[PDB]
From a paper:
Upon cognate ligand binding, [name] oligomerizes and recruits [name] via [name]-[name] interactions. Eventually, the [name] signalling pathway triggers an inflammatory response through NF-κB, MAPK activation and autophagy as well as the production of anti-bacterial peptides, which protect gut epithelial cells from both residual flora and pathogen invasion. Our biophysical, structural and functional data show that [name], via its [name], can form helical filaments, plausibly nucleated from one end by activated [name]. Furthermore, we show that [name] polymerization is essential for NF-ĸB activation by [name], presumably by favouring recruitment of downstream effectors such as the [name] ubiquitin ligase XIAP17.
RIP2CARD has the typical [name] fold comprising a Greek key helical bundle with the N- and C-termini oriented in the same direction and with helix H1 broken into two shorter helices: H1a and H1b. Interestingly H6 is absent in both the crystal and NMR structures and replaced by a long C-terminal loop, visible only in the NMR structure, which contains putative phosphorylation sites. The chemical shifts of the assigned residues of filamentous RIP2CARD closely match many chemical shifts of monomeric RIP2CARD in solution showing that the overall conformation is maintained upon filament formation. The crystal structure of RIP2CARD can be unambiguously fitted into the cryo-EM density, with both N- and C-terminal ends orientated towards the outside of the filament.
Residue numbers in the entry:
A (entry chain D): 7 to 458
B (entry chain A), D (entry chain B): 2 to 458
C (entry chain C): 2 to 457
Amino acid sequence: LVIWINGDKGYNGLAEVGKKFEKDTGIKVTVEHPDKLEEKFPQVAATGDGPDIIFWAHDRFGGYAQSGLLAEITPDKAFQDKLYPFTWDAVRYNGKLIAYPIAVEALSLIYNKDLLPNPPKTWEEIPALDKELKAKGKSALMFNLQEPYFTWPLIAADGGYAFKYENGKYDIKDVGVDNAGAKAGLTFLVDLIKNKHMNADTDYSIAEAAFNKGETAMTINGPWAWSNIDTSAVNYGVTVLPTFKGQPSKPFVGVLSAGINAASPNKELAKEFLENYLLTDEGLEAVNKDKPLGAVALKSYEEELAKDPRIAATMENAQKGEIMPNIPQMSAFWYAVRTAVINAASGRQTVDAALAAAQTNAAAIAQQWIQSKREDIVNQMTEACLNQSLDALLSRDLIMKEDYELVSTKPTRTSKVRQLLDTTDIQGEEFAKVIVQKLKDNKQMGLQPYPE
Amino acid sequence: IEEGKLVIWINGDKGYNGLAEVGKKFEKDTGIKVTVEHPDKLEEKFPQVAATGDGPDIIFWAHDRFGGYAQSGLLAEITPDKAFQDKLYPFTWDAVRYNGKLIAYPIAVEALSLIYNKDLLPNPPKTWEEIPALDKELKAKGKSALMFNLQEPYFTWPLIAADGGYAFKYENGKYDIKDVGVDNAGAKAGLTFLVDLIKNKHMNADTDYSIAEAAFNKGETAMTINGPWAWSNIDTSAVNYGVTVLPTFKGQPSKPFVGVLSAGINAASPNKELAKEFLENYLLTDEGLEAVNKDKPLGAVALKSYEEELAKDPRIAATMENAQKGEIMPNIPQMSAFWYAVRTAVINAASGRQTVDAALAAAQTNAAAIAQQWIQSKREDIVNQMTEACLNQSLDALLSRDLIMKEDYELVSTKPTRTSKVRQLLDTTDIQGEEFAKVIVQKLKDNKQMGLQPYPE
Amino acid sequence: IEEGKLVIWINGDKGYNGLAEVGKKFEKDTGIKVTVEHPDKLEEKFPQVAATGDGPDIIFWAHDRFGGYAQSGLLAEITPDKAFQDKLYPFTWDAVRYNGKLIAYPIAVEALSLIYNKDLLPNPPKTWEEIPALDKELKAKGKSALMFNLQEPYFTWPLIAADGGYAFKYENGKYDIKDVGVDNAGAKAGLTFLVDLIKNKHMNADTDYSIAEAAFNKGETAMTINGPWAWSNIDTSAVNYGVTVLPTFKGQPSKPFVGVLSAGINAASPNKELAKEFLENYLLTDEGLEAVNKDKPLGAVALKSYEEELAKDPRIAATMENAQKGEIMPNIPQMSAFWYAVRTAVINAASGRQTVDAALAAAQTNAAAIAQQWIQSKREDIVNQMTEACLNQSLDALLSRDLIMKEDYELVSTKPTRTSKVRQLLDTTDIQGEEFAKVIVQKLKDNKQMGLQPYP
Amino acid sequence: IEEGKLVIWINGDKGYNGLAEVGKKFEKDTGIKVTVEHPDKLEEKFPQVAATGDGPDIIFWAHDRFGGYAQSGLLAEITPDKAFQDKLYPFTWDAVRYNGKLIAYPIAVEALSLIYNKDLLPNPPKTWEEIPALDKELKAKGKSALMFNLQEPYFTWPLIAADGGYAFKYENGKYDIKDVGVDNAGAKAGLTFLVDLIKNKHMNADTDYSIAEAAFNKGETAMTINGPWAWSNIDTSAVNYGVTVLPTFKGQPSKPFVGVLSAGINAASPNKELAKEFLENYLLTDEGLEAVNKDKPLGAVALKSYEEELAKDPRIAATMENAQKGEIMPNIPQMSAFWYAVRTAVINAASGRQTVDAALAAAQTNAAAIAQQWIQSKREDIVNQMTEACLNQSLDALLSRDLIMKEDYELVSTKPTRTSKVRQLLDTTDIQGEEFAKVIVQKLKDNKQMGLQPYPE
């Protein structure tokens, strides 16, 4: 068995669960923690190779499931009762369970009790608080601005959202990163950076190091981070995220899930490891001891963790927040918002411009419209429309030099358009808008209803 | 405590060496030796030591603490004859009357005044709102406008009460213990302005009494807020000064709490009749009061004959003008809780750990003291009726919220029995505040201790 | 680090807001903006950050840490002209001279003094031995005799050195790095007396700087031990106080270590010439020093012209009298090891985890730092010449004595090669202390690695 | 002062009402009215008022202060005929002889004695070393062993001198003013033992004369140390008491200083011949002395005829036995400096501000008084020769060491000229002690005032 799990989680703890599995049933386990395992998995598993079993938040899994990468798990309904019922809903894609829920996790405000005994319950008082701490040679807040997971709580607060819930399923066309609530949140984050309260290029390692050394009074982070703080022994508390414009911060709530690779031979060996070794009270605490899982999906072990007020704070944040969608659109949404946060923070773009760009990118209206009528476009695109698209795309630097030549050196106009539509999926949504414009310019009225 | 001798406890800021000379007159005349001591936190030391038995024969403090001592049975119920009651002012007797019983002898009325340096500032400000502006000008000449004790809430209260804050509402005859007004907009407005002065570098958050007096008496600041007692040290330094009315806030005047320095006799003393001779025939006389007043001013005295002289001095005229605009302290037992509730809110907001809205909201619940008094009302019932599970549930939950110290937790649990553990828990509820008490009353309601009578809400 | 601007690092207890005003004069005049920061553990943060590259342009600390920075190549070798060298005192230049090279600008000489409350105690004690008696009397009146910072060894050292303790012996010209005197009877006697005061409830084991100053400035204790910098806050509270000579122990006087607050320039800064203008022409002048001194006293300054004024003040006269009776700190790189070796011994003995004889015996070996430096002297030879058996024998024996953490052991053994494992072992020897190193040097001697040169 | 009438000054503890009756006999006979006053600090009031002119006609005090008044020209040089000199004892004349000149009339020899309660303690201790033990036993029965005036050094000196302390060494004929023995091991040993009694709760540091007499006369303590004058009040209370020899220390006996109560005439009085009639023919007679002695005992009188009767009383026999073992006070002007130097050292060591070694080392330099007398020897030269720089340097340095009060500094500097400023500085050097003088003599030597003659060392 080869297990892939994120580096910030308790991998050495999960390695000890593997050595128990090795000692008992004989099968050796290897727990690896490669970088960008969320992006490495869909590459390697699509061909065939990779890990037997993958550990990540439930949002990426429905995208893997639509791609046929994950094995459709079948735990018996006596086992389904041992885990919480809403954690199963997190890993249910089109009436099919695709991974085992391990633990619910959400972001919390983590504050230094010695530097700040009464922490702020509003974002609006943090600028003021920082000015006071600057006098004593410290800062108020410091957290990871690179990843959009951490900054999203602020963005969603006043009224931003990834995809609207249409009371039963998510509307893939109604994206809310553009709306005034979303602008207001990000504007405030940019303003903190502009007024020297925060620093635009602060990553996870900068943030944790600062708070754990006692150089800043507050950080925003999940359960996993608590392990390192205990070591440094900065007298700390975990509490509810500060409010913005009266309304509470809404962090996206992840369910750390374990899905089995569809291209693995060891499908039955993984189910023994998950159901009978990991998802047990002994197994989960071996992981939790190394680096906290959060509030676990296993009912029996959550009973103990609920007593700890840190988990009580984590669940209070998760209640006020909302659960991530598992749908395949989320991967596009995430790296669309990633850019908008980083550009606005560094000051290359404005907030209005950055989120307007991420609005179209997260939606993917053209890129999905092309995908919906894929074969029709291959058959119905004229050789003029192809060249018009190829010219206009090259004039806006949207095609690389290798990608342009790889398209045009195909034998036929049928195969060229195919190779063009292969690169539309790879090269983003602004790429697709050009082609859909040229298809509408040349009046390819055989393609069905157009976007707008 | 010792029979034969008198042991007097009085605050250090007052004229204790002057009162010591009244003792040497008593020693020379009637033979009984007198010892005047001035221990720190004598307001908090007295209810500890006198409850067991020992302590002073006679206690000198403002009248607000006395009704709390009286409800605790610590003070002797004094019986001066009605020929003597006419020698002191009638409203000063009302200050020391607890449930139709006189509990101490009124010595002097005292209230805070604006004390300004005439050389640095000949026309002092009549509004708080112009002090920020005035400070900026004095910063140019290497000085500051105002500087006073921010630690004690007595001094900062004038500003808080001005716009409409209050300790406990008067129900035209007695105080409503449930209607507390430290939370209201008037109270917020006052404290906000005090915080703003500190935030804009006009004042300094951690300024105590010794910092303030030293600064004004050396001529480093143009104004201070203080009572009569402070005038003695200012005369020595000879900073040409005047005492006047406190500045207005939002048009309305500052309302300082008015204290009546009272002398109560300890109920556990053998020398009850020896103290009454010392008070009525030696201290409360024109010779006796001026011996104290010479050392460090008493204020406007309760004795009619000696007030006649002190009324001529314009400093006392200023003190009484402030006291008129202000209002008299309640003597009720709730005040001790109110005071250290407001003490925290002022200090936290000043230092900038909490906001004003948060700090006063915390002090609102603490001053009201609903749980802490509910525990006190059914004290012995809770000792008998609390389960050993409820005890441990409370002890666990209190330790998880850092409400118990490490010494206090171990001192409770190392008691021999549950009856004694719960007793020791309820002993620390009175000491450790009101958020402490809310945990226990929650656990008593969780375990359904129906023996206990109606619950708070 | 940023070219254009100056970033100054100085300790929080000193007058940093005063030095900030010297920066605003520099900004107003020559245009270059100055930022005065005061981070915690700046003595330990500087060698980390400056070794890589970044950090402050200019560093303010006592001269003892500087020779360790200088041996590490962190400090820029300053070249003030000999017309400027005459403006400061000649012995203050000797304080900042490392191997015939001037490494920082001397700002001010500083030493500890007995600071007493005249109202509570008009005639202060001239012997340590009468303080237990004096405390019993003040306990009756609801106060204490003495109260000072027991955490830092700077403050408790005066007592330790008195009867005959010493950091490193002077061999009439240079310090003998192998002759350490924290173990000697004189040193034991001093620390024993400090422990006895704590054991008899006269002092409290976990009293830090903020506890001490607050107590004396509020008028809760009659005496404290502190430097010039503390006088500023006492004036504010206006506790009628005097500064005087430290009390004697066993007849001999207390010997405080004497610091020279020095300003060294970072070798990895682009603004080397901009700092020299700030130091020589703006800070080390009569206007500049008094702007700092007004905020929080520097002490007895190195600048001859401004010392002329400060010498008149009897507090400085008391400070210099203590400094005469004491002795000047070494600047050598061994001092950093000495200090945190004595820090532990003082705190353990005070809290009562160890005895004085045990605590100082531990600090004796640690301060000497014989194995850890011997490993460093033959570092690459040990990487090449250590057997894989000797590695595992060391790793086993170190783990059995709880000297390696669980993370550090696994990080060593998961290296690819035996060459890289030993490297990672010797990387952790520098971090993890001297008792760690004694195990490895024992195993290298057990396996007879007679290619390594003379042993200890 | 007034011509016609006599105004007598005598200490309050002595029999002043008895001496007033001798005045009414003088009034009835010769017509001149007499007024006997008893003002506080009359030892220190006399040299002030008599130096200008006014004061009493005749002064009653122990002979030690008189040679200081005589050197100051305050006392009239008396000339009793040698037929009258035989009526008083010859060694009492030596007590009042300053540089071969008789300066006052000797009235009575007085010395301290151990005065014990026979009912509480029938066999009194003959050693100081057993008093700690004796006190522990009496503490069980609710009483104390010893209690006496610790404020004045007269009473504690017996213990100090015992082992080998002394004021000024006798150089077989005159006293060596430079050889002072308050510092020596014998002196340290004595004071150490006195401090130890106070430290071990046997005695109380702040016990004055009124505390001591009241305690012994009420029967609250078993022993006191006091002179003859105190016996009058003890008889009234009728505590069955005995007077005996002072307890030994380290084997050697306690050496009390022996005073000769003397009556000197003011040099600035017009009634010099009227006082000599009052002294020789009315006071120093058998009728006159017993009128005083009846009110409050004089002691062992200087008048031979009346001592014959008083010698029969065993209390006087005990008093003389103490006086034999002790030694007679010097009359020299240095004694006034010695006394208030030792006064401080006793009080500081007793209260525990200083150690005994530190306190007596301070009093050693102060009693010797090298600078203060050097200033006095070249007083007018220093007024003329001190620069205005040296004045200000002294005034600055003296103020930095808290040696000048705030009133004294301003009173010097507000003089019109430098000649008058230095005069006012040297006026306060005599009042304010010897460490004050060392500063000025340092500054005079710093500025190189070579006009002034040889310097001290």
